[PDB]
Amino acid sequence: SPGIWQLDCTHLEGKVILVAVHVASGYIEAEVIPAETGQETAYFLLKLAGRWPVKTVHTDNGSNFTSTTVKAACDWAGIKQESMNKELKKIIGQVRDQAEHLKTAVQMAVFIHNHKRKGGIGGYSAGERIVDIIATDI
Amino acid sequence: SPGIWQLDCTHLEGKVILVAVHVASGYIEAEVIPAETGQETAYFLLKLAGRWPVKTVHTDNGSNFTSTTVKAACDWAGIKQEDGIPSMNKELKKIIGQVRDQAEHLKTAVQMAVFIHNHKRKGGIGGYSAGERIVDIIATD
């Protein structure tokens, strides 16, 4: 399960957020982009794979995955194509106040989501789960 | 020393590459930006700090770091900003030169070069890559 990611889209304030969730830990990355395009997705995946060892992404059916540029990026990076963010809507809502731009609220919420300890003393954050899973794997 | 990151910039084809180096591992993260503004740096650091446990940052003390926007982002994320504290730039431009022909746009070749830097075995076949060192270094349990 170490290299499996889920990628999905969300539309807010007539704008687009790509969210990737590392499935075994619930760790996320997100970015706001103007539109859900092949180019934008492919750049996103390339960033992702250069940072974590991505093996497989699960995506929705959308055209932005079928593009020639996304397939070239996947081939180049060795990625094979095949709810956790409902919390991210919520966190985006709780911090919307604290910033002018959406892209800033998005990133603040990613920070909050990844650093938040689940459970009591002895708990782990998503950020800690992902690094532990990967370290263990090696 | 595990939460220390150095920030740096490099220029190419007349655009700004913002680079974050994890000091103890060599792991790099990088984005191409329109210009070295307060806002673009703050946005960069905030994305960084949401992805890794960023305790400290060293800067070249460029003017984008003296901006209130950056200092306010560091604050929010609990990062200690350390301006003026002393290449990767050369090694990265050379890797960029090797993949440059495979990408329409610079930004894309930047992420390809980051990927290659992070996956490269350092030393012999018995060794480990930057991507491997950082997780090993950062893993708490």
Ligand SMILES: Cc1onc(-c2ccccc2)c1CO
């Ligand atoms: C080989 C290999 O196997 N896993 C990784 C890796 C890459 C990025 C982050 C963490 C691990 C690598 C290269 O860095």
